[PDB]
Amino acid sequence: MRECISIHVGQAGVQIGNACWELYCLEHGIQPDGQMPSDKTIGGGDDSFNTFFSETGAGKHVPRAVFVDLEPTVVDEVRTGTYRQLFHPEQLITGKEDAANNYARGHYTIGKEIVDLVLDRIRKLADLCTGLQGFLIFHSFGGGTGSGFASLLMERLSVDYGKKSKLEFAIYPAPQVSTAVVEPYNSILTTHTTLEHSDCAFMVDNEAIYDICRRNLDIERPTYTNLNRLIGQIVSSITASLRFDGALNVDLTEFQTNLVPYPRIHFPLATYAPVISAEKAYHEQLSVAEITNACFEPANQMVKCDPRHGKYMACCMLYRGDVVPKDVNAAIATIKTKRTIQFVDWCPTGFKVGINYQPPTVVPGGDLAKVQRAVCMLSNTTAIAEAWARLDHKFDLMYAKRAFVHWYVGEGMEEGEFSEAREDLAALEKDYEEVGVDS
Amino acid sequence: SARQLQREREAMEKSEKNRLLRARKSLHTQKELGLRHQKLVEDAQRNHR
């Protein structure tokens, strides 16, 4: 039935998958051992856990995910954790040499060595499943493991399965802050692969996360744990109608069909709400209209872009928790008449209604409070094209005198791809502005 | 190789010439500065009188 396979490439992908799995186990009452030892006082678990987990003959739950990494240090770090009794060691493939923010080695001399192993793993996982809809590929553009290895694997997955949905989730190199220097070098190569060989791609960054946490959660020393928690909550909200039901169930296909207006424009803008701390959720009356209006605020966007620079074409609306349809109708009536929000002169309306009866849960030790209902937004606008413009500018000003290119030449690749990627990005941007231009 | 290096020191000279051009620009800007101060003093004093 509604079952999907998650793919985790790189340290970021592995930790994001860990956060997602732990969120799923805490929200479904799944114990870290893998059994149901709660024989005295029950606390839930009688639901449809088949979407992600599996039920054995002895009552065991086996995760359905792919934890691959070229560096073994992350695999060792996860292995010594408290959840080592949940997954299987065959699912965490180590490696001798890693990419570590390099596309050349991780795409030719490193990623091409372990192909059959992961292919057999994913084939076995797919055979163990009955109904397959899409995939959850978690990687990063800055990380060499999450860029070269991810590209080469998805290129084979696309040609091996055309009828299945291919999603994408990674991290965007912020124009202001960054972790490494060669991030644009891997990004300019991964964008072409994710554009000409995938169906949908979700693009997020970290500076917006830092801004929203310091503004709402009010923390002075942030950490990656809350960053992963936010992404896990976003993913759970996206795939909410699959594990459970509601008034209007919205499956992966149901929203993916409309979220893609064109084969070239498939980069939605995600926005989660409410992103608040414990104290920010007590003396605050929360309704649907206010949070829906706040979702369009650029400060609450995970991508640093002003929506007023461009306009919207396609919008995907979701909900999770005790939400009343009258509030949704009132919010839609309010936003359709707002002059601040810009939209194309041809599409008068577009959005979805996903009613989820199950309210979001909390985690002991996290920062999220007990909120009666949640909301997530996936819109499509041309105002986000500035990020590609800045990335192209940076690549051009780094490519004039060929900085840190001799390494890639020595590793083995054809230099014309830089020109190919540059011209492909230029054409894609041109298409974006052509679409953004009305009559 | 030494000819490429001498091309690059010629580029050094060209960068110095760019600095000269921007210095001319700065001279024009500081002339416009003397002008705002002169106007904002004299015309305002005429208004005061």
């Binding site: 240090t73 570590a100 942030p222 940076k394 840190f404 | 030494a2 020191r9």
Partner: protein, 432 residues
């Protein structure tokens, strides 16, 4: 698995290597006997990088000491930890180098090199896979400089796919130890720029000045310098020895840190250099570290980085603080100090934090940066070399060995080309 083979050359190299081994043994909890007396967690898993598994848990060091004088042996064995190493690795000859590079390379570098090649080959074959080879030596003599370059050439010829990192000691006209030191330096720099992956600059006068004006030591000696360089080496290797959240490795640095192979020199540096009475009155925070890591007072060269432009910068931290502070600090530094780094390349600072703090100190962070400051040293070395080679003084000793004089000519031609390249890349303009 992934191990690192360590090499030794030169009496100063031998003493600094012994100091580093003692420092790491103390940090990781090793008694002088040879057993294990640690009490940590990560000191057992990746402990095999510098040690070897044997019976009874008695880890053995992995280092080959190459020397031409037997007098260095008995000195380093008599120490509290000189009884823990492998006596077979201490390959010494019978005749001294006499501070001669050519004589040490020719006479003392033919019949003795075979044994060290055999033992290093045996050590490499004893392990499954390796990353690189670390050699610590000095350019002030014929032992470290006369033999290390040949050994590096041999190992790169045999195993090209290995990391060639070293910490040779740069000379100084103010504080000198050899009359023919410029000749040996000129001879060694050719091999360093031709058959070496990367090289770090080490100076004694700068460390002496630092320990005098900041540490304020009573009787500073070579032991303090060895301790400081050992701490620097430990801070460099903690990225692999003690993995954390964002771990790094030597080769990733050498790739991201070296824009051109001809320019592979660096400048190390450690942050918390405080006096004895200032240890109990200090503020453990990020901006103080950024300032002691950005100014030229704590840095360990006898030159001024402010005379040029920063090319590549790496900030390696070892502690548990944050991630946002580092990026905001580097961003505001780049915004304010715009006239100190290459404007063509933005974001010239690399972030690296080690979650595992070192033993004995909570906060630690090192500097691996390549600023435009070695041009002065290069030009003064070239000038003094030309001055001495004009009338050909102190040359008959080299002539009597068998090697000709065209080697000096080609070396000085290479030096002129390299310094011209450095000076034309110093003021890297954006356009015409």
């Amino acid at each position: 698995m992934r191990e690192i083979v360590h090499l030794q050359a030169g009496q100063c190299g031998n003493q600094i290597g012994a100091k580093f081994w003692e420092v790491i043994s103390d940090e990781h909890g090793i008694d002088p006997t040879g057993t294990y007396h640690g009490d940590s967690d990560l000191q057992l898993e990746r402990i095999n990088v510098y040690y070897n598994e044997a019976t009874g848990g008695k880890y053995v060091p992995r280092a080959v000491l190459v020397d031409l004088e037997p007098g260095t042996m008995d000195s380093v064995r008599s120490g509290p930890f000189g009884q823990i190493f492998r006596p077979d690795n201490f390959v010494f000859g019978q005749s001294g180098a006499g501070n001669n590079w050519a004589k040490g390379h020719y006479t003392e570098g033919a019949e003795l090199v075979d044994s060290v090649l055999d033992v290093v080959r045996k050590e490499a074959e004893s392990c499954d896979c390796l990353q690189g080879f670390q050699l610590t030596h000095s350019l002030g003599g014929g032992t470290g400089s006369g033999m290390g370059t040949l050994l590096i050439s041999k190992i790169r010829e045999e195993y090209p796919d290995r990391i060639m990192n070293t910490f040779s000691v740069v000379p100084s006209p103010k504080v000198s130890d050899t009359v023919v030191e410029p000749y040996n330096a000129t001879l060694s720099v050719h091999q360093l720029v031709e058959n070496t992956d990367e090289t770090y600059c080490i100076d004694n006068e700068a460390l002496y000045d630092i320990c005098f004006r900041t540490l304020k030591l009573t009787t500073p000696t070579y032991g303090d310098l060895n301790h400081l360089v050992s701490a620097t080496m430990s801070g460099v290797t903690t990225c692999l020895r003690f993995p954390g959240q964002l771990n790094a490795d030597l080769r990733k640095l050498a790739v991201n840190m070296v824009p051109f192979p001809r320019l592979h020199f660096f400048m190390p540096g450690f942050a918390p250099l405080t006096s004895r009475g200032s240890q109990q009155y200090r503020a453990l925070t990020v901006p103080e570290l950024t300032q002691q890591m950005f100014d030229a007072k704590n840095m360990m060269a006898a030159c001024d980085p402010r005379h040029g432009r920063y090319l590549t910068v790496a900030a390696v931290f070892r502690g548990r603080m944050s991630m946002k502070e580092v990026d905001e600090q580097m961003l505001n530094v780049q915004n304010k100090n715009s006239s100190y780094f290459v404007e063509w390349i933005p974001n010239n600072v690399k972030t690296a934090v080690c979650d595992i703090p070192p033993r004995g100190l909570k906060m630690s962070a090192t500097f691996i940066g390549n600023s435009t400051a070695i041009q002065e040293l290069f030009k003064r070395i070239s000038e003094q070399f030309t001055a001495m080679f004009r009338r050909k003084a102190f040359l008959h000793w080299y002539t009597g060995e068998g090697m000709d004089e065209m080697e000096f000519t080609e070396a000085e031609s290479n030096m002129n080309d390299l310094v011209s390249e450095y000076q034309q890349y110093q003021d890297a303009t954006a356009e015409e």
